[PDB]
């Protein structure tokens, strides 16, 4: 998702689907840096 | 027009992207493993 070589244009977005996984996101800390990250409906400290 | 009690000043250097993580209730490598702030935090945050 994050490391994909080619991204879509904004007028035709991908809309991928995900299931059957554990969602451990600390595996991103080393590789990527985000300038924006905001969550709605949930607090970012409960995501684990 | 106020008089402050128990004043402390903490100082460090981060990269530009991770400035947004110095706030109560955040997640990321800096908030998780380096520097954490209380939920009931009274004070001010300055960065340049
Ligand atoms: C963290 O990312 C850098 C970027 O290339 C890499 O050199 C380093 O090995 C990574 N950390 C670990 C523990 O692999």
Resolution reading in Å: 2.9
CA pair distance A39, B13, nearest whole angstrom: 26
Question: Among A33, A35, A45, whose Cβ lies nearest the Cβ of B27?
Answer: A45
Which of B17, B25, B32 has the CB atom closest to A43's CB atom?
Answer: B25
The answer to whether the CB of B42 falls within 8 A of the CB of B19 is no
Q: How far is A30 from chain B (nearest CA, A)?
A: 9
Q: Do B35 and B22 touch, CB atoms closer than 8 A?
A: yes
Q: Which residues contact A3 (CB under 8 A, 6 or more apart)?
A: A31
A7 CB burial (10 A radius; 0-12, 13-18, 19+):
exposed
Distance CA A45, CA A5 (A): 30
Cβ atoms within 10 Å, residue B18: 18
CA–CA dist A41, A5 (Å, integer): 31
How far is it, in rounded angstroms, from Cα B46 to Cα A10? 35
**B25 neighbors A44 (Cβ within 8 angstroms):** yes
What does the alpha-carbon distance between residue B35 and residue B18 come to, in Å, rounded to a whole number? 11
Using a CB-CB cut-off of 8 Å, the residues of chain B touching A24 are none
């Amino acid at each position: 998702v994050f490391n994909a070589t080619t991204f879509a244009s904004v007028y035709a977005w991908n809309r991928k689907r995900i299931s059957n996984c554990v969602a451990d996101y600390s595996v991103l800390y080393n590789s990527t840096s985000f300038s924006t990250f905001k969550c709605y409906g949930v607090s970012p400290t409960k995501l684990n | 027009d106020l008089c402050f009690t128990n004043v402390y000043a903490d100082s460090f250097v981060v990269r530009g992207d991770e400035v947004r993580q110095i706030a109560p209730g955040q997640t990321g490598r800096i908030a998780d493993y380096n520097y954490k702030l209380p939920d009931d935090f009274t004070g001010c945050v300055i960065a340049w």
